[PDB]
Design an enzyme around this catalytic site. Structure first.
Site, PDB file in Angstrom:
ATOM      1  N   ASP A 171       1.052  -1.080  -0.148  1.00  0.00           N
ATOM      2  CA  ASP A 171       0.086  -0.128  -0.188  1.00  0.00           C
ATOM      3  C   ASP A 171       0.939   1.294   0.171  1.00  0.00           C
ATOM      4  O   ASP A 171       1.710   1.535   0.751  1.00  0.00           O
ATOM      5  CB  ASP A 171      -0.986  -0.199   1.173  1.00  0.00           C
ATOM      6  CG  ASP A 171      -1.966   1.298   1.162  1.00  0.00           C
ATOM      7  OD1 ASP A 171      -3.018   1.132   0.647  1.00  0.00           O
ATOM      8  OD2 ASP A 171      -1.723   2.169   1.881  1.00  0.00           O
ATOM      9  N   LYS A 173      -2.566   6.133  -4.126  1.00  0.00           N
ATOM     10  CA  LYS A 173      -3.769   7.133  -3.676  1.00  0.00           C
ATOM     11  C   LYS A 173      -3.519   8.689  -4.323  1.00  0.00           C
ATOM     12  O   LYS A 173      -2.614   8.943  -4.495  1.00  0.00           O
ATOM     13  CB  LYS A 173      -3.716   7.214  -2.107  1.00  0.00           C
ATOM     14  CG  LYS A 173      -3.826   6.081  -1.406  1.00  0.00           C
ATOM     15  CD  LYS A 173      -3.990   6.254   0.163  1.00  0.00           C
ATOM     16  CE  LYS A 173      -3.964   4.884   0.936  1.00  0.00           C
ATOM     17  NZ  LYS A 173      -2.635   4.435   0.943  1.00  0.00           N
ATOM     18  N   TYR A 203       2.988  10.409   0.460  1.00  0.00           N
ATOM     19  CA  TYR A 203       4.134   9.935   1.254  1.00  0.00           C
ATOM     20  C   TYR A 203       5.627  10.288   0.501  1.00  0.00           C
ATOM     21  O   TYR A 203       6.519  10.269   1.411  1.00  0.00           O
ATOM     22  CB  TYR A 203       4.148   8.373   1.588  1.00  0.00           C
ATOM     23  CG  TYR A 203       2.836   8.020   2.303  1.00  0.00           C
ATOM     24  CD1 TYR A 203       1.756   8.854   2.911  1.00  0.00           C
ATOM     25  CD2 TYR A 203       2.242   6.693   2.273  1.00  0.00           C
ATOM     26  CE1 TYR A 203       0.681   8.270   3.466  1.00  0.00           C
ATOM     27  CE2 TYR A 203       1.080   5.989   2.598  1.00  0.00           C
ATOM     28  CZ  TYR A 203       0.522   6.926   3.138  1.00  0.00           C
ATOM     29  OH  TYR A 203      -0.686   6.272   3.780  1.00  0.00           O
ATOM     30  N   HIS A 237      -7.869   9.663  -1.472  1.00  0.00           N
ATOM     31  CA  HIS A 237      -7.140   9.452  -0.160  1.00  0.00           C
ATOM     32  C   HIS A 237      -7.999  10.365   0.679  1.00  0.00           C
ATOM     33  O   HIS A 237      -8.183   9.488   1.874  1.00  0.00           O
ATOM     34  CB  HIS A 237      -5.799  10.274  -0.270  1.00  0.00           C
ATOM     35  CG  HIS A 237      -4.768   9.730   0.506  1.00  0.00           C
ATOM     36  ND1 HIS A 237      -3.409   9.550   0.577  1.00  0.00           N
ATOM     37  CD2 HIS A 237      -4.904   9.319   1.944  1.00  0.00           C
ATOM     38  CE1 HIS A 237      -2.778   9.017   1.450  1.00  0.00           C
ATOM     39  NE2 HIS A 237      -3.587   9.055   2.287  1.00  0.00           N
TER      40      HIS A 237
HETATM   41  N1  LIG Z   1      -5.457   6.109   3.783  1.00  0.00           N
HETATM   42  C1  LIG Z   1      -4.921   6.696   4.697  1.00  0.00           C
HETATM   43  O1  LIG Z   1      -5.033   7.923   5.135  1.00  0.00           O
HETATM   44  C2  LIG Z   1      -3.909   6.193   5.548  1.00  0.00           C
HETATM   45  C3  LIG Z   1      -3.656   6.556   7.033  1.00  0.00           C
HETATM   46  C4  LIG Z   1      -2.824   5.944   7.627  1.00  0.00           C
HETATM   47  C5  LIG Z   1      -2.202   4.925   7.259  1.00  0.00           C
HETATM   48  N2  LIG Z   1      -2.435   4.181   5.949  1.00  0.00           N
HETATM   49  C6  LIG Z   1      -1.849   2.923   5.483  1.00  0.00           C
HETATM   50  O2  LIG Z   1      -1.830   1.933   6.553  1.00  0.00           O
HETATM   51  C7  LIG Z   1      -0.814   1.484   7.100  1.00  0.00           C
HETATM   52  C8  LIG Z   1      -0.575   1.057   8.470  1.00  0.00           C
HETATM   53  O3  LIG Z   1      -1.093   2.182   9.568  1.00  0.00           O
HETATM   54  P1  LIG Z   1       0.206   2.690  10.360  1.00  0.00           P
HETATM   55  O4  LIG Z   1       1.454   2.893   9.711  1.00  0.00           O
HETATM   56  O5  LIG Z   1      -0.509   4.377  10.867  1.00  0.00           O
HETATM   57  O6  LIG Z   1       0.147   1.991  11.795  1.00  0.00           O
HETATM   58  P2  LIG Z   1       0.269   0.335  12.269  1.00  0.00           P
HETATM   59  O7  LIG Z   1       0.585  -0.443  10.966  1.00  0.00           O
HETATM   60  O8  LIG Z   1      -0.943   0.193  12.832  1.00  0.00           O
HETATM   61  O9  LIG Z   1       1.407   0.376  13.327  1.00  0.00           O
HETATM   62  C9  LIG Z   1       2.832   0.843  12.871  1.00  0.00           C
HETATM   63  C10 LIG Z   1       3.861   0.694  14.037  1.00  0.00           C
HETATM   64  O10 LIG Z   1       3.575  -0.455  14.656  1.00  0.00           O
HETATM   65  C11 LIG Z   1       5.100  -0.999  15.001  1.00  0.00           C
HETATM   66  N3  LIG Z   1       4.933  -2.461  14.544  1.00  0.00           N
HETATM   67  C12 LIG Z   1       4.753  -3.040  13.588  1.00  0.00           C
HETATM   68  N4  LIG Z   1       4.882  -4.307  13.562  1.00  0.00           N
HETATM   69  C13 LIG Z   1       4.641  -4.717  14.936  1.00  0.00           C
HETATM   70  C14 LIG Z   1       4.452  -5.836  15.734  1.00  0.00           C
HETATM   71  N5  LIG Z   1       4.363  -7.016  15.268  1.00  0.00           N
HETATM   72  N6  LIG Z   1       4.299  -5.832  17.347  1.00  0.00           N
HETATM   73  C15 LIG Z   1       4.687  -4.439  17.877  1.00  0.00           C
HETATM   74  N7  LIG Z   1       4.633  -3.484  16.986  1.00  0.00           N
HETATM   75  C16 LIG Z   1       4.772  -3.409  15.556  1.00  0.00           C
HETATM   76  C17 LIG Z   1       5.863  -0.270  14.005  1.00  0.00           C
HETATM   77  O11 LIG Z   1       7.336  -0.068  14.283  1.00  0.00           O
HETATM   78  P3  LIG Z   1       8.403  -1.221  13.706  1.00  0.00           P
HETATM   79  O12 LIG Z   1       8.469  -0.318  12.179  1.00  0.00           O
HETATM   80  O13 LIG Z   1       9.489  -1.152  14.573  1.00  0.00           O
HETATM   81  O14 LIG Z   1       7.730  -2.608  13.535  1.00  0.00           O
HETATM   82  C18 LIG Z   1       5.193   1.216  13.610  1.00  0.00           C
HETATM   83  O15 LIG Z   1       5.798   1.847  14.757  1.00  0.00           O
HETATM   84  C19 LIG Z   1       0.259   2.667   6.757  1.00  0.00           C
HETATM   85  O16 LIG Z   1       1.482   2.495   6.703  1.00  0.00           O
HETATM   86  C20 LIG Z   1      -0.470   3.303   5.475  1.00  0.00           C
HETATM   87  O17 LIG Z   1      -0.040   2.301   4.274  1.00  0.00           O
HETATM   88  C21 LIG Z   1      -3.424   4.929   5.353  1.00  0.00           C
END
Ligand SMILES: NC(=O)c1ccc[n+]([C@@H]2O[C@H](COP(=O)([O-])OP(=O)(O)OC[C@H]3O[C@@H](n4cnc5c(N)ncnc54)[C@H](OP(=O)(O)O)[C@@H]3O)[C@@H](O)[C@H]2O)c1
Ligand SMILES: [Co+2]
Length: 309
Positions: free
Chosen positions: A43, A77, A48, A110
């Site tokens: 994704d 997006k 970004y 987005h």
């Molecule tokens: N459409 C939108 O507006 C929108 C908004 C936000 C996000 N997104 C998409 O959705 C994705 C995910 O959301 P997110 O990046 O906000 O947060 P997330 O995936 O819920 O959590 C990310 C955090 O959790 C840690 N983590 C990862 N795996 C883990 C595990 N197994 N155990 C403990 N901690 C862990 C990561 O650090 P490490 O790197 O050290 O593991 C990182 O700091 C984004 O990357 C993006 O592609 C889209």
């Protein structure tokens, strides 16, 4: 459990690599490592900035024969400054060029929010959104083959329904914040009734984003389920979403956790433990403050989310 089927017939892999907040050099390594570990879903988002880097990792993966292009599900997006119909296919072409692909598997609006082309999120840049006009242009990129599927991000039930009502090509996906602390039950039921797939972003509660203050992997219900099943809290959080029928986009740069985030397929949360998720306190973490404003079409958070907050 490894795939869900979109209303276009195409399969979306249930786990994809999130890439929000992945700096210089680090994201390409994560995408490379995730795909060799077995990820088939990446994704991305133009806003970004790191799509050129992602494209170079994909190019290396193809050349080394790790995967073929049709093995991968690539999402990007359309950012808020390209909603104007004439700008939509140009924005897609730029994301395609940076990623070095001929087509995306999924192209998302987005946000339900518009600013003047080439300007930033500031009140003197706000244009009133015209989602139907923008969707019409998204439809043409779908008809032209550049996006195998089109959809939206951060759309409430209402807004998703308002778009379904006017649309020729149904949105295939609504990608939203969704995790045990924000379970999106309203939107979940509504997607089921409409054939829209729900992709969970921030499926772990984004622990590593300061300003969201996410401690989801710390809820006692998750910890308890995690030790009675012998899994990490993360795995339990991810599995919960998959068992709700949602794809998940865990973001990570650590190789070991990337692999752990894929191990959510061949086991289940039993019915008696799953019922306990109704005991988790509910709070939306990505509130959308940056587009709530006296000059914005959303003057309150409720107006942005249509009650779902
Ligand atoms: N459409 C939108 O507006 C929108 C908004 C936000 C996000 N997104 C998409 O959705 C994705 C995910 O959301 P997110 O990046 O906000 O947060 P997330 O995936 O819920 O959590 C990310 C955090 O959790 C840690 N983590 C990862 N795996 C883990 C595990 N197994 N155990 C403990 N901690 C862990 C990561 O650090 P490490 O790197 O050290 O593991 C990182 O700091 C984004 O990357 C993006 O592609 C889209
Ligand atoms: Co229809």
């Amino acid at each position: 459990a490894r795939h869900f089927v979109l209303n276009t017939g195409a399969k979306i892999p249930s786990v994809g690599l999130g890439t929000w907040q992945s700096d210089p050099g680090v994201v390409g390594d994560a995408v490379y490592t995730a795909v060799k570990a077995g990820y088939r879903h990446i994704d991305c988002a133009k806003v970004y900035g790191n799509e050129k880097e992602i494209g170079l990792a994909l190019k290396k993966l193809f050349e080394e024969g790790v995967v073929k292009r049709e093995d991968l599900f690539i999402t990007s997006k359309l950012w808020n400054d390209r909603h104007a119909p004439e700008d939509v296919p140009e924005a897609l072409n730029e994301s395609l060029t940076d990623l070095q692909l001929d087509y995306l598997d999924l192209y998302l609006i987005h946000w339900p929010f518009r600013v003047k082309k080439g300007t930033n999120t500031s009140p003197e840049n706000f244009i009133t959104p015209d989602i139907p006009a923008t969707w019409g242009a998204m439809e043409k990129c779908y008809d032209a083959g550049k996006a195998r599927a089109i959809g939206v991000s951060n759309f409430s039930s209402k807004k998703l329904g308002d778009l379904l009502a006017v649309a020729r090509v149904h949105p295939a996906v609504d990608q939203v914040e969704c995790h045990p602390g924000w379970q999106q039950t309203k939107l979940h039921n509504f997607c089921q009734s409409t054939g829209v797939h729900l992709t969970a972003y921030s499926p772990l509660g984004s622990p590593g984003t300061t300003w969201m203050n996410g401690n989801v992997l710390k809820e006692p219900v998750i910890i308890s389920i995690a030790e009675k099943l012998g899994k990490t809290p993360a795995q339990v959080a991810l599995r919960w979403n998959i068992q709700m029928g949602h794809s998940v986009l865990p973001k990570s740069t650590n190789e070991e956790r990337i692999k752990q985030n894929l191990d959510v397929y061949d086991w289940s949360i039993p019915d008696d433990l799953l019922a306990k998720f109704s005991e988790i306190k509910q709070a939306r973490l990505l509130r959308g403050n940056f587009i709530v404003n006296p000059q914005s079409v959303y003057k309150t958070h409720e107006e942005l989310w249509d009650g779902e907050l």
